[PDB]
Every structure is written in structure tokens, then in C-alpha cells.
């Protein structure tokens, strides 16, 4: 498998991060009937590259379904044990998926759990029995780590929402949308303020999700967040990962919103599951991040595009960050499936399980 | 002697401040003075100011006395005859009294604009300036709520609430220990002042400083309404640097200018950096 090529000139501060282009892909230098990589893995990597699956739990679910299909299509070779052979076989697939798009924390945790489950397979176990048990374990993981873990968080966040509240959300989040919909269904009467940002503009995925539910929702961009915050009662933010030092790694417009919310005495709430907890730490968005396609910053304002041909200018760089890190002092409450714990109890949950 | 009797009788107007009555007594005793030299008049009025601040231990009396002495020096620097200079002093004191007795109305007119419709205002104790500001605000068809602390030393909060209830304004009396509790429900804090120090801070009731901190911790706006004759050339480094003549359970304390947003004087809306400029231009 050939390595993916870099596109454009990266920033000096982010020169250690890969920057790819959505237009080009690796499937041009691969077999049409895939042989080295599994066809399901190739489809998943193409969907990750084209941006068809652009979430956090959705990416993990798609990866787990592709892994289930691979295990179902897996056949152990002679003279080899399944425990080592499957682990050695699933490594190039993860390398190709990382080449397509940098993996998320949920995907890393799922890969680690599946590797542990495969390594913990006995030798005397039959092939079909082991494959069926692995599929059942993946199904139970999906059930009790995403589906069952969201209902507990929705039930815990219901007692924190009161009548007449003004909740401010940001971007697109499955857990936040589910919590708001269930709170409106239970009987709570409030209104939501949706904040969005360029170039993904995924906040509209939540806005039209609330109007279809009946919740009165407003829409505005992230530069106008300090104007609407004086009327906001509480801020509900989604988390892509909770680091071992209490910091919150999420969409690039999260730490800024939490900082501006602190200046207005607005409590900041973070919702995340226990399967997204990382044992690693991070103090700034410079050591580990993701550089998306820099051609997405181009916008047509008026008649022409100011960034139509930015490659001609030598000293012109286009930075398109994806993730950012929020310090623990800006987070007031963290809602998980175990209960409402402070932002400093992240290692404890990492130690219990 | 009889200067204390006149000064205490001048405070029969419930709306007249103590410093205003002190200045009026000083002007009356300057009029009735039979001296023939400027130095003797200066010394007699200095001892009279000493006696007045010995009667009333407020900072406003000392500020007014210093302002009167500076005005005397300024009027003496020009003519140097002590007869025409005395007539000039008399007419200038008359004009100064007529101009300074109506400063509260101007402060209210220029400050009542900062109050929005439906906002929450926090006050510490009873002061005529905040009362006039709230009256001018409610006269402009504005609706708001007022929280006031009781000021345990002397229950001025209940008096302020009783005075505000006559204006048909929703008022609620809170305890001095509950300042940090209702701080989140207050949109702005408006306090008076008994004396403005050189740097820009204020000298007010004992429960003021601890309220300026709790507001700073919550980014709440903190406005101070005070007149111009309360500018005194003092620089307290801390709570212990305040002179004992003003504190006497302390009855007064100092608040730093970094915790003050704006000052509303008869000179206009100023920052804490303008008091030092005015005091330097005055050469007090």
C-alpha cells in the first residue's frame, strides 16, 4: 500500500501533522477487487476520506461493523493460531484507515478492546465459535458503550434542565441532540441557541434536528457568541475525548466557547461516555491535532474568491484545524453514564475500569 | 463654642449632606469674621475645620474643609488686598454653594441612563445619591428590581428599602453575609461614597469592599456615584493605612480603583484615573 501524499504547504507550527487533500485518494493505486486490504476496509477508508462519515460515535460504529464483517470473512491459515494471526492481520487495515483519515479516540479505544478480546481467545476454541463470540462481544460493546451509555446520560442531564432555560449548544453532537429531544419529550420547556462555525457548518445538522422535534431554536455564528451569551442560562458542549489530565479534546470551537462563557458567569457542561476516556494527556492543540483540506477555507463573497489561487503566493499558508483542547478549570460539570462527576475524576473512571 | 451649634442646626435639611453643611458653616464664619489679615483668617478657619471634623468624624467633612482652604488660597493669590479679596471670596463662596447644592440632580441625570429595563441593581447602604438616581430612573418609565444589604452596624438598608417602597420599586432586603449569594442574580452594583482617594478608590461603609471583590469575581459592573467635594488627597496602601479618625468595629473602609468601573460626579462620567488628574490640576 503506497503512502498518501501531502497537499499544499503546511504551517511551520503544524509541520509535524499530515495534511491531505479530499480530491485525491489511495484507491487509484490499488486493486479494483481488493486483495491486500479487505473490501469492507477499503469502503470504510473511502467513506472516511470523502467525509461521508464525519462524526465520532458513527465512525466507531462503522469501524466495528467493518471489523465484524472482516472477522466473518476471516479464515485462519494452517499451522497458525487465531489469537496471533488475527491481530497481525488487522494491523495493515488500521494503518490504511489511518492513512485515509487520522483515527479518533473512540476508534482507538475500540481497536484496543477488540485486540484484547482477540488475544484473550483460548487455543482449544473452534474457529466458527470464536468468530461468533467475537461478533457477539462487538455487539455487546456497541450496545452497552454507546446505546445504553446514552440513555443514562440523557436521564442524568434531565434533572439539570429547568423550565425557561436557555441552553447554548455548539456544532453537531449525537448525545447533545438526544438529550435535548428527550428533555423536550419528558415535559421540559426551554429554548436552544445553536452555534456554528466554518467550513463544516455541521451545526445545521442539529438545528434542523430540533425544529423537527418542536424545540424553539436560534442560529448564529461563533464570532457572535459574546452577544448572545448574556441571555444564555447554561452551555451544553459535546466531547470527542476526555484526557487523563482533565482536559477536553473536542471540535476547535469548544475551548473558545468555554472561555467566553466563563466571562459571563454561564455554567459549562460537558457530556461524554466512559469509553472515550484517554489515558494520555495533552496541554495544547499543537502537539496532536488534525489538518483537514486547506481548500475548504475558500468562500465566494460577492463576485470573486479571495483565496482562489493561494498556492501561487509563496508565503501564504492556510490553516484548517479540526480539534482543540480545553483546560479543566473552564469545565464545571461532566455528565457520564456513572453519574455527574467533576472534571478531575477522569483518572478515577480510568482506574475503576 | 457656637460653631458646633450652627453646624448641627444646619443639618435640619434631611437632604443636605454633612460636607455641604460644614462648607456653609465655614462660609458663614468667614462672613462674620472680624479679622484684618489673611493669615489670621486662614488659621482661624483651619482650627474651625479641625473642630468640625472633631464633631463629625466623616471623610466628607475633611474633604470639604480642604476644598474650602484651597479655594481660600486660590482667591488670596489673585487680589492681595483682603478687602476686595474678601468680597471676591464671599461672592465666589455664594456661587460655589449654589452650584454644589444642585450636583446630586446632575449626577442623577447623567447616571440614570446606564440602568436598563428589567435589570437588577445592588446597593449596600442608604445614600441620597443612589436614591436620587433611582428616582430619576423610575421617572423615565423604567422597571427594575433593587437588592440592598442591611448594613448591620446601623440598619440603613431597611431605611433605604422603606424610602424606595414609596417610589413603587420592588426592593428586597438581604443580609450582609448573603452578598456573595445574590451576586449572581444582580446585573449591576451601584454604591455611594464618602470620600474618593487620590488613585481612584473610594472610602465607604465597612461592607462595601467585600462587595466590590465578589462582583469582580463575577465580572459584574460596579459604579460609584459621588459628588465633587468628596475628592480628598489620601493614599491608603491597605485597610490599615486608613486614618483612625475616619474608621472610628470599623465604621468605614477603603476600596481600590481596580474594582471600580465608573464614577458619576457632577463633572460627568469619569474613570478612576480622572480623580488624580483633577486633584493635580487643583494643586490642593
B11: closest CA of chain A, how far (Å): 44
Which B residues, 142 through 161, put their C-beta within 8 Å of a C-beta on chain A? none
**Helix (H), strand (E) at residue B148:** strand B145-149
CA distances from A2 to A36, A101, A212 (A): 12, 15, 45
- Compute the distance between CA of residue A55 and CA of residue A59 in angstroms, rounded to an integer: 6
> Does A263 contact B218 at a Cβ distance shorter than 8 Å?
no
- Enter the C-alpha cell of residue A260: 467566553
CA angle B56, B60, B64 (to 5 degrees): 105
In chain A the beta strands, taken as DSSP E runs, fall at 166-170, 191-196, 217-221, 234-238, 241-242, 248-251, 268-271, 323-326, 333-335, 340-341
Query: Which are the contacts of A345, defined by CB distance < 8 A and separation ≥ 6?
Result: A334
> From the centroid of its chain, how far is CA B40?
30
**Chain B CB contacts of A264 below 8 Å:** 219
Tell me if residue B162 falls in helix, strand or coil.
Answer: helix
Give the residue on A whose Cα is nearest the Cα of B187. A230
Quote the minimal CA–CA distance from A199 to chain B in Å: 33
Contacts of B219 in chain A (CB under 8 A): 263-265
Are the CB atoms for A235 and A257 separated by under 8 Å? yes
Residues in CB range of B31: below 8 A, 6 or more apart: B90
Cell output for B207: 461592607
How far A329 CA sits from the closest chain B CA (Å)? 15
Three-point CA angle B8, B9, B12, nearest 5°: 105
Residues of chain A neighbouring B184 (CB-CB closer than 8 A): 265
Which uninterrupted H or E stretch holds A275?
none
Q: Cβ B218–A265 below 8 Å, yes or no?
A: yes
The C-alpha cell at A349 is 473512571
Q: Is B185 on the interface with A (CB under 8 A)?
A: no
Q: Is B184 on the interface with A (CB under 8 A)?
A: yes
Phi, psi of A192 (to 5 degrees): -110, 140
Give the total residue count for chain A.
353
Query: B183 contacts in A (CB within 8 Å)?
Result: none
Using CA of residue A131, residue A133, residue A138, residue A143, what is the dihedral sign?
Answer: positive
Question: Between β-strands A248-251 and A241-242, what pairing exists: parallel, antiparallel or unpaired?
Answer: antiparallel
- Residue B6's H or E segment, with its range, is helix B3-10
List, edge to edge, every strand of the sheet that includes A241-242. Answer: A241-242, A248-251, A323-326
Which residue is listed with cell 483668617? B41
Nearest-angstrom CA–CA distance, A224 and B188: 23
Give CA separation, A45 vs A51, A227, B251, in Å: 10, 41, 74
Distances (CA, A) of A306 to A11, A198, A320, B172, B214: 19, 16, 16, 58, 48
Residue B71: partners with Cβ closer than 8 Å, 6 or more residues away: B89, B92, B93, B96
Rounded to whole angstroms, the Cα distance separating A327 from A259 reads 10
- Give how far A97 is from chain B: nearest CA, Å: 47
Q: How many angstroms separate the CA atoms of A183 and A176, rounded?
A: 10
Min Cα–Cα distance to chain B from A194, Å: 24
Residue of B nearest to A263 (CA): B219
| Alpha-carbon radius of gyration of chain B | 20
User: What count of CB pairs under 8 Å joins A to B?
Assistant: 5
The C-alpha cell 462524526 sits at A55
> What are the DSSP E strand ranges found in A66-196?
166-170, 191-196
Task: Return the closest-CA partner of residue B133 out of B262, B10, B275.
Answer: B262
Distance CA B146, CA B133 (A): 12
Rounded distance between C-alpha atoms, residue A74 and residue A66, angstroms: 12
The secondary structure of B218-264 as a DSSP string is TT--EEEE--STTB-----SSSTTS-HHHH---S-EEE-GGG--EEE
Report chain B residues whose CB lies below 8 A from the CB of A265: 184, 218-219
Instruction: Sheet with A234-238: list strands edge to edge.
Output: A217-221, A191-196, A166-170, A234-238, A268-271, A333-335, A340-341
For the stretch B272-277, contacts whose Cβ atoms lie closer than 8 Å and that sit 24 or more positions apart, written own/partner, are: B272/B199, B272/B200, B272/B201, B273/B200, B274/B200, B275/B196, B275/B197, B275/B198, B275/B199, B275/B200, B275/B231, B276/B198, B276/B199, B276/B200
Question: Closest by alpha carbon to A336, among A317, A350, A315?
Answer: A350
Cα separation, A68 vs A63, in Å, equals 9
Query: What burial class does residue B220 get, using C-beta atoms within 10 Å of its C-beta: 0-12 exposed, 13-18 middle, 19+ buried?
Result: buried
Q: Count H helices and E strands in chain A, helices first.
A: 11, 10
Q: Do A263 and B184 touch (CB under 8 A)?
A: no
Name the residue with cell 470504510. A44
The residue in chain A having the minimum alpha-carbon distance to the alpha carbon of residue B219 is A263
Indicate which technique resolved this structure.
Answer: cryo-EM
Pick the residue from chain B with its C-alpha nearest to A265. Answer: B218
Give dist(CA A55, CA A181) in Å, integer. Answer: 19
Looking at chain B from residue 204 to 223, which residues have their Cβ under 8 Å from any Cβ of chain A? 218-219
| Assigned C-alpha cell, A81 | 493460531
- B207 within 8 A of B149, measured Cβ to Cβ: yes
* Mutation for B interface: A265, A266, A267, A332, most B CBs within 10 A: A265
- Which residues have CB under 8 Å from B48's CB, separation 6+? B3, B25, B26, B29
Could you give phi then psi for residue B24, rounded to 5 degrees?
A: -65, -40
Name the grid cell of B57: 468624624
**Nearest chain A Cα distance for residue B121, angstroms:** 16
The closest alpha carbon to A111, from A45, A60, A48, A39, belongs to A60
Q: Give the CA diameter of chain B.
A: 62
C-alpha B38/C-alpha B61 separation (Å) is: 23
Taking contacts as CB-CB distances below 8 angstroms, the residues of chain B near A266 are none
Rounded Cα gap, residues B162 and B210, in angstroms: 24
Q: What is the 3-state secondary structure (H, E, C) of B42-86?
A: HHHHHHHHHHHHHHCCCHHHHHHHHHHHHHHHHHHCCCCCCCHHH
Please state the domain extents for chain A. Answer: 1-152, 153-353
Chain A residue with CA closest to B215: the answer is A265
Residue A263 with chain B: CB contacts under 8 Å: 219
Q: Which helix (H) or strand (E) holds B145?
A: strand B145-149
Distance, in Å, from the CA atom of A278 to the CA atom of A246, rounded to the nearest integer, reads 10
Which residue from B minimizes the CA distance to A267?
A: B184
Q: What are A253's three cell numbers?
A: 470551537
Q: Give the residue on B whose Cα is nearest the Cα of A230.
A: B187
Bond before A199 cis per omega within 30 degrees? yes
Question: How far apart (Å, rounded) are the C-alpha atoms in residues B86 and B79?
Answer: 9
- Judged on CB neighbours under 10 Å (0-12, 13-18, 19+), A35 is exposed
What is the rounded distance in angstroms from the CA atom of residue B71 to the CA atom of residue B91? 12
A264 to B184: CB separation less than 8 angstroms, yes or no: no
Residues of B in contact with A229 (CB under 8 A): none
- Contacts of A281 by beta carbon, 8 Å cutoff, 6+ apart: A243, A244, A245, A247
d(CA A46, CA A59): 12
Which residue is closest to B186 within chain A, CA to CA? A265
Distance from CA of B219 to the nearest CA of A (A): 7
Domains of chain B: 2-106 (1.20.120.1070), 107-282 (3.40.50.10470)
Instruction: Read off the C-alpha cell for A66.
Output: 467493518
Q: Are residues B153 and B251 in contact, defined by beta-carbon separation less than 8 angstroms?
A: yes
Q: How far is B257 from chain A (nearest CA, A)?
A: 20
**Sheet with B195-196, side-by-side order of all strands:** B195-196, B202-204, B253-255
In whole angstroms, what separates CA A255 from the centre of its chain? 16
State phi, psi for B101 to the nearest 5 degrees.
Answer: -75, -15
Smallest CA–CA separation between A283 and chain B, in Å?
A: 25
Q: Which of B119, B189, B219 to mutate to test the interface with A (most CBs of A within 10 A)?
A: B219
Q: How far is CA B90 from CA A69, A249, A320, B97, B169, in A?
A: 103, 74, 75, 11, 43
B46, B72 Cβ separation under 8 angstroms: no
Bridge partners for B255 per DSSP: B202
Amino acid at each position: 500500500v503506497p503512502t498518501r501524499k501531502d497537499y499544499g504547504s503546511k504551517v511551520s507550527l503544524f509541520s509535524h501533522l499530515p495534511q491531505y487533500s479530499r480530491q485525491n485518494s489511495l484507491t487509484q493505486f490499488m486493486s479494483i477487487p481488493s486483495s491486500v486490504i479487505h473490501p469492507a476496509m477499503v469502503r470504510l477508508g473511502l467513506q472516511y476520506s470523502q467525509g461521508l462519515v464525519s462524526g465520532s460515535n458513527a465512525r466507531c460504529i462503522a469501524l466495528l461493523r467493518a471489523l465484524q464483517q472482516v472477522i466473518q470473512d476471516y479464515t485462519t491459515p494452517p499451522n497458525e493460531e487465531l489469537s496471533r494471526d488475527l491481530v497481525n492481520k488487522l494491523k495493515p487495515y488500521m494503518s490504511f484507515l489511518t492513512q485515509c483519515r487520522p483515527l479518533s479516540a473512540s476508534m482507538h479505544n475500540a481497536i484496543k478492546f477488540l485486540n484484547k478480546e482477540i488475544t484473550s481467545v483460548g487455543s482449544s476454541k473452534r474457529e466458527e465459535e470464536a468468530k461468533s463470540e467475537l461478533r457477539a462481544a462487538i455487539d455487546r460493546y456497541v450496545q452497552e458503550k454507546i446505546v445504553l451509555a446514552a440513555q443514562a446520560i440523557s436521564r442524568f442531564a434531565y434533572q439539570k434542565i429547568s423550565n425557561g432555560d436557555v441552553i447554548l449548544v455548539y456544532g453537531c453532537s449525537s448525545l447533545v441532540s438526544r438529550i435535548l429531544q428527550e428533555a423536550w419529550t419528558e415535559g421540559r420547556r426551554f429554548r436552544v441557541v445553536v452555534v456554528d462555525s466554518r467550513p463544516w457548518l455541521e451545526g445545521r445538522h442539529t438545528l434542523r434536528s430540533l425544529v423537527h422535534a418542536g424545540v424553539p431554536a436560534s442560529y448564529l455564528l461563533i464570532p457572535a457568541a459574546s452577544y448572545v451569551l448574556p441571555e444564555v442560562s447554561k452551555v451544553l458542549l459535546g466531547a470527542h475525548a476526555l484526557l487523563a489530565n482533565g482536559s477536553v479534546m473536542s471540535r476547535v470551537g469548544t475551548a473558545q466557547l468555554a472561555l467566553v462563557a466563563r466571562a459571563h458567569n454561564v455554567p459549562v457542561l460537558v457530556c461524554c461516555e466512559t469509553y472515550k476516556f484517554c489515558e494520555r494527556v495533552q496541554t495544547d492543540a499543537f502537539v496532536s491535532n488534525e489538518l483537514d483540506d486547506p481548500d475548504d477555507l475558500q468562500c465566494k463573497r460577492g463576485e470573486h474568491v479571495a483565496l482562489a489561487n493561494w498556492q501561487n503566493h509563496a508565503s501564504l499558508r492556510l490553516l484548517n484545524l479540526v480539534y482543540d483542547v480545553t483546560p479543566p478549570e473552564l469545565v464545571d460539570l461532566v455528565i457520564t453514564e456513572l453519574g455527574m462527576i467533576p472534571c478531575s475524576s477522569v483518572p478515577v473512571v480510568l482506574r475503576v475500569k | 463654642e457656637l460653631i458646633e451649634y450652627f453646624k448641627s442646626q444646619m443639618k435640619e435639611d434631611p437632604d443636605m449632606a454633612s460636607a455641604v453643611a460644614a462648607i456653609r458653616t465655614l462660609l458663614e464664619f468667614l462672613k462674620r469674621d472680624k479679622g484684618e489679615t489673611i493669615q489670621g483668617l486662614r488659621a482661624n478657619l483651619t482650627s474651625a475645620i479641625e473642630t468640625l471634623c472633631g464633631v463629625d468624624s466623616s471623610v466628607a467633612v475633611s474633604s470639604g474643609g480642604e476644598l474650602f482652604l484651597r479655594f481660600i488660597s486660590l482667591a488670596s493669590l489673585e487680589y492681595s488686598d483682603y478687602s476686595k479679596c474678601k468680597k471676591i471670596m464671599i461672592e465666589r463662596g455664594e456661587l460655589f454653594l449654589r452650584r454644589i447644592s444642585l450636583s446630586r440632580n446632575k449626577i442623577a441625570d447623567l447616571c440614570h441612563t446606564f440602568i436598563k429595563d428589567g435589570a437588577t441593581i445592588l446597593t449596600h447602604a442608604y445614600s441620597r445619591v443612589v436614591l436620587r438616581v433611582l428616582e430619576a430612573a423610575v421617572a423615565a418609565k423604567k422597571r427594575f428590581s433593587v437588592y440592598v444589604t442591611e448594613s448591620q452596624p446601623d440598619l440603613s438598608g431597611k431605611k433605604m428599602a422603606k424610602a424606595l417602597c414609596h417610589l413603587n420599586v420592588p426592593v428586597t432586603v438581604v443580609l450582609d453575609a448573603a452578598v456573595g449569594y445574590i451576586m449572581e442574580k444582580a446585573d449591576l452594583v451601584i454604591v455611594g461614597a464618602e470620600g474618593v482617594v487620590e488613585n481612584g478608590g473610594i472610602i465607604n461603609k465597612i461592607g462595601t469592599n467585600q462587595m466590590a471583590v465578589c462582583a469582580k469575581a463575577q465580572n459584574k459592573p460596579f459604579y460609584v456615584v459621588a459628588e465633587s467635594f468628596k475628592f480628598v488627597r489620601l493614599f491608603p496602601l491597605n485597610q490599615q493605612d486608613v486614618p483612625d479618625k475616619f474608621k472610628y468595629h470599623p465604621w468605614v473602609d477603603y476600596t481600590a480603583p481596580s474594582l471600580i468601573t465608573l464614577l458619576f460626579t457632577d463633572l460627568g462620567v469619569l474613570t478612576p484615573s480622572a480623580v488624580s488628574d483633577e486633584l493635580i490640576k487643583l494643586y490642593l
